[PDB]
């Protein structure tokens, strides 16, 4: 009868507005992970195995080596108030207790997360994650007090390889420990459609230099949505037994579903 938490990125596809591969691109990244002889190789999607597709992002998440995806780089001029917004159409309002976005390349200096309250509706961001949010986001740093405040504990490119981000929904917030008795937080944690808002990467003025490699480097790369969650239906089902129409909706009592 007890609810069972399972990875919310299983057998699901991220709806990504932009993804590498469709054009021919040549990109280079730090030699921390790729380990190429010159740390330079060409991104592509035609190759069946090297696809950076949506499914690869949300999969078993092999610990030894998990399939990674790269977003479009600065070559596509992706630096605006709004940018690539890859979204998650799971199919149920999963209570995402713990979120982890293992970055394949590095932690972007400026980025955010946007969550959907109801299907096809607007986006309710959880929190902003930038070390200089007072400019890009116009908000106080070192978020503390419920609002989608900034974050600077892990903002700059500290790891430079296999970056780790702890998007602890139930921790690091004033309402961290009142999850089971916080009506707003219960609505906060549940997200119909996950969407990481990589709104902009604050450039360091290197654009005037316009080196072909560097522009191809200051890009985004989500190695895996190490995100877990479950149907918040009082676990009428230890696992949302799908219904006839081949989707995910919850089990229920009182002659309901």
């Amino acid at each position: 009868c007890m609810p069972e938490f399972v990875n919310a990125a299983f057998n699901v596809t991220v709806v990504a507005t932009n993804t590498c591969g469709t054009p021919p691109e040549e990109y280079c990244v730090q030699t921390g992970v790729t380990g190429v002889t010159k740390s330079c190789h060409l991104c592509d999607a035609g190759q069946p195995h090297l696809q950076h597709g949506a499914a690869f992002l949300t999969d078993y998440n092999n610990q030894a080596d998990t399939t990674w995806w790269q977003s479009q780089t600065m070559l596509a001029g992706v630096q605006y108030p709004s940018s690539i917004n890859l979204t998650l159409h799971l199919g149920k309002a999963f209570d995402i207790t713990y979120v982890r976005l293992k970055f394949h390349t590095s932690r972007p200096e400026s980025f955010a997360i946007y969550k959907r309250t109801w299907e096809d509706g607007p986006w309710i961001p959880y929190q902003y994650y930038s070390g200089s949010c007072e400019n890009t986001y116009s908000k106080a740093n070192r978020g503390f007090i419920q609002q989608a405040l900034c974050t600077d504990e892990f903002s700059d490119i500290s790891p430079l390889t296999g970056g780790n981000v702890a998007f602890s929904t139930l921790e690091g917030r004033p309402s961290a420990y009142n999850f089971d008795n916080s009506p707003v937080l219960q609505e906060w944690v549940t997200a119909t459609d996950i969407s990481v808002t990589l709104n902009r990467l604050n450039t360091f003025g290197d654009e005037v230099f316009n080196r072909p490699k560097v522009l191809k480097s200051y890009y985004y790369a989500i190695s895996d949505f190490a995100v877990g969650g479950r149907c918040k239906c009082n676990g009428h089902a230890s696992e949302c037994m799908k219904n006839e129409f081949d989707k995910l909706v919850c089990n229920c009592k009182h002659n309901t579903y």
Binding site: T31, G131, S132, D156, N202, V208
Partner: protein, 260 residues
Amino acid sequence: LGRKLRADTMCGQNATELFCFYSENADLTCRQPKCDKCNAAHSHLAHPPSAMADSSFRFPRTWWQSAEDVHREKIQLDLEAEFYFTHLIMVFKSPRPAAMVLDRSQDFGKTWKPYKYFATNCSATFKKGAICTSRYSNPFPCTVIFRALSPPYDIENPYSAKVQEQLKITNLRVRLLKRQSCPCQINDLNAKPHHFMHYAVYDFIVKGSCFCNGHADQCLFHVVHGRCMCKHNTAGSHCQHCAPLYNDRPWEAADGRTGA
């Protein structure tokens, strides 16, 4: 990065003592030491300071630490020309001590100052936005994040000499005072381990754009030099002055917003 970083002697030189890595698992629990031998005989047994700053094209990563259980350990980073920096980074596999200081040198190692230093008790080094800030350094886990450019400096940032001094460097150093190795299951066997001295440091790569005053498109493993053929008919290594063909018109550094 991609150059020599002189420092003191490497490990075990004055003491042929066993050294081991008390690395930690993903469960925040230490693992059994991966004891090895430090020497100066073979590359595998000889790991000079150059290991961190060299072409890292191989899957295994280059390790490094202090010289011989010495607190006042410094890293010398010689330059053959002027350089440029973007922001401050700090990677330190060993537990990051509060006594961390970031310092910048102006020209030919002839200047020194406490450029930036932040920690929970920044007094350990010896507005509260640049001198030092709290809630930024912790003893654990073992295995500081700050940005040099000021919040008002992000926008309206031309490339004239008025800002060159902020991000023009000649040498690099760093000092750590507090000594500590993050806790382990040291009682792994009946006999306690020995000679566990180590300062696990991952690597140091502070990327610096080829200083060309934001004019040159190409500046003369392969490494970044300091000579630029800046466009807009500009001459000089720093490209701070334009050609006399139409220099009579007043001008300052070509800000990237419009390249005036």
